[PDB]
Amino acid sequence: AAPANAVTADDPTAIALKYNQDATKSERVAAARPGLPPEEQHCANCQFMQANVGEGDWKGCQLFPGKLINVNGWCASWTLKAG
Numbered sequence: 001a002a003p004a005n006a007v008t009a010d011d012p013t014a015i016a017l018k019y020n021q022d023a024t025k026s027e028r029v030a031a032a033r034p035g036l037p038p039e040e041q042h043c044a045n046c047q048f049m050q051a052n053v054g055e056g057d058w059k060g061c062q063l064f065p066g067k068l069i070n071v072n073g074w075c076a077s078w079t080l081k082a083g
């Protein structure tokens with residue numbers, strides 16, 4: 001069950017970025033974002049994931065203020081976690 005503040009499929013920015021809380025149900029292959037092969041990309045290894053926000057599998061994303069993403073998710077702004 002998603003948290004009350006989870007990013008939802010109906011969120012305009014989620015639609016624009018093609019977010020899904022399950023990266024296996026994402027278009028990461030089509031997007032081919034750089035830094036890792038697409039099959040390896042999900043929120044947990046993204047620079048925008050905020051490890052100190054949320055709990056468990058539901059963590060912050062800088063791009064979605066006030067909400068939570070799933071660590072196993074993906075969107076088209078995926079960027080390698082470099083620091």
Ligand code: SF4
Nearest residue numbers: 043046048049061075
């Ligand atoms: S920017 Fe990164 S952490 Fe945020 S939803 Fe997209 S892939 Fe997940």
